[PDB]
Design a protein around this ligand. Structure first.
Ligand SMILES: *[C@@H]1O[C@H](CO)[C@@H](O[C@@H]2O[C@H](CO)[C@@H](O)[C@H](O)[C@H]2NC(C)=O)[C@H](O)[C@H]1NC(C)=O
Ligand SMILES: *[C@@H]1O[C@H](CO)[C@@H](O[C@@H]2O[C@H](CO)[C@@H](O)[C@H](O)[C@H]2NC(C)=O)[C@H](O)[C@H]1NC(C)=O
Ligand code: CLR
Ligand code: CLR
Ligand code: CLR
Ligand code: BUF
Ligand code: NAG
Ligand code: MG
Ligand code: MG
Ligand code: NA
Lengths: 32, 996, 291
């Protein structure tokens, strides 16, 4: 039915993106 | 009535020193050789107060915490919180089921102010805490003669009118009136700035109590000799006491950064109330009532108040102050970190600040040639030639014929900073021999001294005879030193490369010109000579008792002169050059003698080589000084004696027509007068000093710089910045950082001020077009105090785009921190595009869910209604209340995300004000993390489970993340062509209209 | 310092005349370009959506359940005697049913007589524009017995024992699916389970359920629900003047001078509910006939 949206997949992707972007930024400020 | 009290303290002191010993003992009632009875001493001790300055005014910690809770920026946020609670109070009593938004915002603004206060308070308190760790006040007991007996009592138990004795090394307790001296030399450096140890004689010499020798002063140290005296002044009534009390009771002024923030708030609230009032009238003209229009006015005014710019500006200043504390340049006041950059006229002190305040061997004479020795504080200079026989003889004459030796603990300390017991001149000689000629311990004991002759009161000469340890000649080695005029009369032989020659005038006149060269250079010169006593007329058994002529006074062998002076610190000349390069006027203000002040000025850079004073031209032309036109003289020396008879206009002319000025023999009060004269011109002033005489000058100056170790406690407390390492180059670093953080603050402010247009425009058109609310309040908080915090803080880490130490100091009346160009950029061009991008994402979300944009007009009337659950969209569908409200909140979330997307480009373009993003480069790692954290945080606030419940932020369909991309690219390209036209065309359109 | 208004060297409000013209011209060109850009992008956005169907329809998954007296707080408080006390209600009922009169549904080119008995769904092809303007099934007021009447311009409704009709939220392409014959305890209802969306009202607690004595439902042919022959909806563009099904509910035995809560819950598989939106699927009302 067109009255359904897979919000769990989009939400999961957004949380994974936020996690990767934040850990990458942390690697950016830790130049070693 | 404290005005009169301060006025009687701005005047130079008076005295009664010029009195016969009988008139003095009659006025004070004291025995000249027995002092007074202990009962009389206790009666005065319990009559006027102990001999100690009244403690400073204690500053309770709740006072400065409330201070951090107030100010100019925090006050704007306070009025914003008050307006929020006023609006909420109106909304509570007047309408049904009032909204908690305004209350939420008011408590948030209050929390922002309180947190900023806690942070800034902890920082200033940390600075003062590490400052208390520098007060090493060791009690010092004075030697007082009372009832005919000598007793050592605490300095505070000393009273007025009692006999006091001081020994070489002891500190002058109170202000004494010398009655009997024995070759006594005191140290008036920390008080009157007099570098060389000024001797103290019982006879009155000068009408000025500071210049005369019959007066010892509070906080001064008796260098050599012993003396007696009657205490004339005690406690706060003393000279340095009146100076310290004047310093404590002076005005601090308004720092330039503070005035800039105030002007910034003036423009912020100006446009805020303009928009609020014009929209209040517009709302009443449309349909809304006074009840609603008042809430609109408060919402528009409060919305235009940067809530996070306070914490960002504070952290900016804190970061730069952190770098200052890293280089041992501590700032007591936070905003004081910026004043150095805005400075345009530096008034410096000579003794202890421009110089090392220590006698050092400057130049030597040998083979009719001048040899300059290394006079740096850390020994990082050129070393003279130390392989000739003339040096091997002169070094022994100095290392042997000298009453100077190291003390007990002088082992691990360096050769220069270590303490030496004796005369300052002999100390400089001992250090130079111990540094450039091995060691003087084994060199002095190698030549066993037989008979010596110390310095004489007339024809000052110091001689001594020693045994000869050479394995080729057993003749006695006699050495003697003294003034060159006393040694020239007792010399016939001259040493050269190892052999002797007669006193031919061809080289004797060359010695005279060398003497006048080292003398005219402001240095003190001495002559050294020696002679081999014939072991045939004075065998090894004969004892030359110091009674008659046992040594030939004349026919000696002169080896060479040895000059000495207090040399400037290592990086002092280079620092002065850097300051002048940045367009900062350097003016020396010292109480030392003019003959030495002019030499040190020319040696450090205050007086450029080639420039002539009003007297130099008259001397070069052999004409009276009253004839030369002062306009033909760029530099000028102003004596303190003449400064006393000056008016305001005269001092104004001295500073306006003379570029290199040197104030000599100036009292601390005159130093304050000079600082005020410089401030009358309207320029930022920085006073750099160490002694107590720098307290009233460092206090009244826009920014005071005290020496962390070589400085006095009074001027160190009355200052605004401390140099814990005494590295005068820190002044240059300070003037650089002060300009650096200034420009970075401009960038950071333009960033926070750009986000206000897309934060207010949704509400504005919500009032006009009557469309559903495009942007929510909590989302606005997630932008101002959420994402944008890291980019704005990272904007402080930006470096110089061009050379900042090259441009002239900013004009306070022209280059303001937030000029009308920043408003035209943030509020006018960039923020406008960001607002359009937000509205685009808004219309995309609503048109895709069934509400075409054209249909959104006049829809908010029934949209916001909580009971109309059948709201027709553009497709004929019926929407309930919560369904369409879910769309409005899931419509606020992408508006916030759109803000972050446009802030990416806004941050990259604000990072560079004139250079291109490709020229400067994304080398700011904090900025990269700022964008990464900003985006990750924005995504987390939308996709975290339970956000549409707590913060009412619902998840976004991925295509929403791209509705804002073209606007960001547009912003970036627009600002890029802006900076490109500014680069290619530096004349006026793009520069005077948008370049802020 | 705030009298920079003018000078003999040409300045107005802060700057000169030629500078005012330069800045004004720049801002006009700049904002004009911004407007053209926003309009062009909004046009592309208009080109990404169709005229016969909304792109996203998930935010209206559970249809709502509204009523005719759009009360300020879903409360019906009036006096059985004072005609002005219940004027706000009757006005909205007459205005709502003004499009259901026999004279309003007179054109045979846009109206189609569905039938006196609820039948299966009526699918009129696809949602494209290849077909002409679809037909809308008629719904005469006579179906709502005891709450329609043959009154004059003013529908003399019920003073004592009021009437409250319910309506299902019009959704494009929505096909209502009533519950299976395996009804999980659905409060006595007729056996016409296959071609009508059931809607049953009740109290809210042990008190409201006792105060509300008897309720009488009215619908198509006498069934308490919505007939499937009127669905699905094909948008306002393709089906203008569409009349969604209606179903009236009358509360005969009420306790006068007492505010009682009623919950009219619509049942079905394609009918969702929500603890946050008391209108999604269900519907609430606070009736109080104070004499
Ligand atoms: C509609 O209202 C009428 C009253 O106008 C109801 O008619 C009554 O019905 C009862 C049976 O339930 C009879 O005993 C009465 O004699 C009738 N009175 C009149 C005046 O006709 C009718 O029942 C109502 N319809 C429904 C479906 O409840
Ligand atoms: C309608 O409701 C009334 C109550 O308002 C019912 O009549 C009451 O019945 C109780 C006994 O259970 C008596 O104690 C009351 O005196 C009665 N009141 C009246 C006014 O008659 C009545 O039975 C209900 N009728 C229907 C058809 O539901
Ligand atoms: C201008 C460029 C270099 C910036 C690079 C970042 C861009 C490409 C990133 C930043 C945030 C990202 C989005 C983060 C969140 C969502 C939701 C997720 O469930 C699908 C991906 C999607 C839709 C991403 C698409 C790509 C995106 C827009
Ligand atoms: C809700 C709507 C109608 C309000 C419209 C406001 C527009 C027309 C206003 C808002 C801000 C204004 C600008 C503010 C800044 C500048 C720079 C200044 O030195 C001259 C005025 C100028 C160039 C203004 C032009 C008009 C302007 C763009
Ligand atoms: C001169 C050139 C570079 C300008 C080209 C404009 C481009 C960058 C703009 C014009 C219209 C824009 C699109 C308009 C429509 C859609 C559908 C929407 O649901 C998501 C945004 C999205 C996907 C936009 C992405 C960016 C876009 C394609
Ligand atoms: C409560 C509010 C009243 C007007 C209308 O009913 C909409 C309501 C919800 C949104 C709320 C406004 C009030 C002003 C805002 C806080 C005001 C604002 C926003 C951010 C900010 O920093 O300062 C003010 C603009 C809109 C606002 O957020
Ligand atoms: C449902 O079941 C009843 C008997 O339990 C039967 O009479 C009725 O016809 C059934 N309806 C359908 C649609 O199967
Ligand atoms: Mg803001
Ligand atoms: Mg000094
Ligand atoms: Na100060």
């Amino acid at each position: 039915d067109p009255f359904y949206y897979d919000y769990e997949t989009v939400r999961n992707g957004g949380l994974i993106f936020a996690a990767l972007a934040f850990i990458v930024g942390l690697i950016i400020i830790l130049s070693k | 009535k404290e005005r009169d009290m301060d006025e009687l303290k701005k005047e130079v002191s008076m005295d009664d020193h010029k009195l016969s010993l009988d008139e003095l003992h009659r006025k004070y009632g004291t025995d000249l050789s027995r002092g007074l009875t202990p009962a009389r001493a206790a009666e005065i001790l319990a009559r006027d107060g102990p001999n100690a300055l009244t403690p400073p005014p204690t500053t309770p910690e709740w006072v400065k915490f409330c201070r951090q809770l107030f100010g100019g920026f925090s006050m704007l946020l306070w009025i914003g919180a008050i307006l929020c609670f006023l609006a909420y109070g109106i909304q509570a009593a007047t309408e049904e089921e009032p909204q908690n938004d305004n209350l939420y915002l008011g408590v948030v603004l209050s929390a922002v102010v309180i947190i900023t206060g806690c942070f800034s308070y902890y920082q200033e308190a940390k600075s003062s805490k590490i400052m208390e760790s520098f007060k090493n006040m060791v009690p010092q007991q004075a030697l007082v003669i009372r009832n005919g007996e000598k007793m050592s009592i605490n300095a505070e138990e000393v009273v007025v009118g009692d006999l006091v004795e001081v020994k070489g090394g002891d500190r002058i307790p109170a202000d004494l009136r010398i009655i009997s001296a024995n070759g006594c030399k005191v140290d008036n450096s920390s008080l009157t700035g007099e570098s060389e140890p000024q001797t103290r004689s019982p006879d009155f010499t000068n009408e000025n109590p500071l210049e005369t020798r019959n007066i010892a002063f509070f906080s001064t140290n008796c260098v050599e000799g012993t003396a007696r005296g009657i205490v004339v002044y005690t406690g706060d009534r003393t000279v340095m006491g009146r100076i310290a009390t004047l310093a404590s009771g002076l005005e601090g002024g308004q720092t330039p950064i503070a005035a800039e923030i105030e002007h910034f708030i003036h423009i912020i609230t100006g446009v805020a109330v303009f928009l609020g009032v014009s929209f209040f009238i517009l709302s009443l003209i449309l349909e809304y009532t006074w009840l609603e229009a008042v809430i609109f006015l408060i919402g528009i005014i409060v919305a235009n108040v940067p809530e996070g710019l306070l914490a960002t500006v504070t952290v900016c200043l804190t970061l730069t102050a952190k770098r200052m504390a890293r280089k041992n340049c501590l700032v007591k006041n936070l905003e004081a970190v910026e004043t150095l950059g805005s400075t345009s006229t530096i008034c410096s002190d000579k003794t202890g600040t421009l110089t090392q305040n220590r006698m050092t061997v400057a130049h030597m004479w040998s083979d009719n040639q001048i040899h300059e020795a290394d006079t740096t504080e850390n020994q990082s200079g050129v070393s003279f030639d130390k392989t000739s026989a003339t040096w091997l003889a002169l070094s022994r004459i100095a290392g042997l014929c000298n009453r100077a030796v190291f003390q007990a603990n002088q082992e691990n300390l360096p050769i220069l900073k270590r303490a030496v017991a004796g005369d300052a001149s002999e100390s400089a000689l001992l250090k130079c021999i111990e540094l450039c000629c091995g060691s003087v311990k084994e060199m002095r004991e190698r030549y066993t001294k037989i008979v010596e002759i110390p310095f004489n009161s007339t024809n000052k000469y110091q001689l001594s005879i020693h045994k000869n340890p050479n394995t080729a000649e057993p003749r006695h080695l006699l050495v003697m030193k003294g003034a060159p005029e006393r040694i020239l009369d007792r010399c016939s032989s001259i040493l050269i490369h190892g052999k002797e020659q007669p006193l031919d005038e061809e080289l004797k006149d060359a010695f005279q010109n060398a003497y006048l060269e080292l003398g005219g250079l402001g240095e003190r010169v001495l002559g050294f000579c020696h002679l081999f006593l014939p072991d045939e007329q004075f065998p090894e058994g004969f004892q030359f008792d110091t009674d008659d002529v046992n040594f030939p006074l004349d026919n000696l062998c002169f080896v060479g002169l040895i000059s000495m002076i207090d040399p400037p610190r290592a990086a002092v000349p280079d620092a002065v050059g850097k300051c002048r390069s940045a367009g900062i006027k350097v003016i020396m203000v010292t109480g030392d003698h003019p003959i030495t002040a002019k030499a040190i000025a020319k040696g450090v850079g205050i007086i450029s080589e080639g420039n002539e004073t009003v007297e130099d031209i008259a001397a070069r032309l052999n004409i009276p000084v009253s004839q030369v036109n002062p306009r033909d003289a760029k530099a000028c020396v102003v004596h303190g004696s003449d400064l006393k008879d000056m008016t305001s206009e005269q001092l104004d002319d001295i500073l306006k027509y003379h570029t290199e000025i040197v104030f000599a023999r100036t009292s601390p009060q005159q130093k304050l007068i000079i600082v005020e004269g410089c401030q009358r011109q309207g320029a930022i002033v920085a006073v750099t000093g160490d002694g107590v005489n720098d307290s009233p000058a460092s206090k009244k100056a826009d920014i005071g710089v005290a020496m962390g170790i070589a400085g006095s406690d009074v001027s160190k407390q009355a200052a605004d910045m401390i140099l814990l390492d005494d590295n005068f180059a820190s002044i240059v670093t300070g003037v650089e950082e002060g300009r650096l953080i200034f420009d970075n603050l401009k960038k950071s402010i333009a960033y926070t001020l750009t986000s206000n247009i897309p934060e207010i425009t949704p509400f504005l058109i919500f009032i006009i077009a009557n469309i559903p609310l495009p942007l929510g309040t909590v989302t606005i908080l997630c932008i101002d105090l959420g994402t944008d915090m890291v980019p704005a803080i990272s904007l402080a880490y930006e470096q110089a785009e061009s050379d900042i130490m090259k441009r002239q100091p900013r004009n306070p009346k022209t280059d303001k921190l937030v000029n009308e160009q920043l408003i035209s950029m943030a509020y006018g061009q960039i923020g406008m595009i960001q607002a359009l991008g937000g509205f685009f994402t808004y219309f995309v979300i609503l048109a895709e869910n069934g509400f075409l944009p054209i249909h959104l007009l006049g829809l908010r009337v029934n949209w916001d209604d909580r009971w109309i659950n059948d709201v027709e969209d553009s497709y004929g569908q019926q929407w309930t209340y919560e369904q369409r409200k879910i769309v409005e909140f899931t419509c606020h979330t992408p508006f916030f995300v759109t803000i972050v997307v446009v802030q990416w480009a806004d941050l990259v373009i604000c990072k560079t004000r004139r250079n291109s993003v490709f020229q400067q480069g994304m080398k700011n790692k904090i900025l990269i993390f700022g964008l990464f954290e900003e985006t990750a945080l924005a995504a987390f606030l939308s996709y975290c489970p339970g956000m549409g419940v707590a913060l009412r932020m619902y998840p976004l369909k991925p295509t929403w993340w791209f509705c804002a991309f073209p606007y960001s690219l547009l912003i970036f390209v627009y600002d890029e062509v802006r900076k490109l036209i500014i680069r290619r065309r530096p004349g006026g359109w793009v520069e005077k209209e948008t370049y802020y | 310092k705030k009298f920079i208004w003018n000078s003999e060297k040409k300045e107005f409000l802060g700057r000169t005349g030629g500078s005012w013209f330069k800045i004004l011209l720049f801002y006009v060109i700049f904002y004009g370009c911004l407007a053209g850009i926003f309009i062009g992008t909004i046009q592309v956005m208009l080109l990404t959506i169709s005229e016969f169907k909304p792109t996203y329809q998930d935010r209206v998954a559970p249809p709502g359940l509204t009523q005719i007296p759009q009360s300020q707080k879903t409360e019906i408080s009036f006096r059985p005697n004072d005609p002005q006390s219940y004027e706000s209600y009757v006005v909205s009922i007459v205005r709502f049913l003004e499009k259901y009169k026999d004279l309003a549904q007179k054109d045979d080119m846009i109206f189609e007589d569905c039938g006196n008995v609820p039948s299966e769904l009526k699918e009129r092809g696809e949602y494209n524009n290849e077909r002409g303007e679809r037909k809308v099934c008629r719904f005469r007021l006579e179906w709502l017995g005891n709450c329609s009447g043959l009154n004059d311009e003013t529908y003399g409704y019920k003073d004592g024992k009021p009437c409250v009709i319910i309506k299902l939220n019009r959704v494009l392409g929505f096909k209502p699916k009533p519950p299976k014959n395996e009804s999980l305890e659905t409060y006595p209802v007729m056996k016409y389970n296959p071609y009508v969306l059931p809607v049953h009202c009740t109290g809210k607690r042990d008190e409201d359920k006792e105060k509300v004595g008897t309720m009488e439902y009215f619908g198509l042919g006498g069934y308490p629900g919505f007939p499937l022959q009127y669905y699905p909806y094909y948008g306002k563009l393709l089906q203008p003047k569409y009349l969604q099904p209606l179903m009236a509910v009358q509360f005969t035995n009420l306790t006068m001078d007492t505010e009682i809560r009623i919950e009219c819950k619509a049942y079905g598989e394609n009918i969702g509910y929500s603890e946050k939106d008391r209108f999604q699927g269900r519907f609430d009302v606070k009736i109080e006939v104070k004499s």
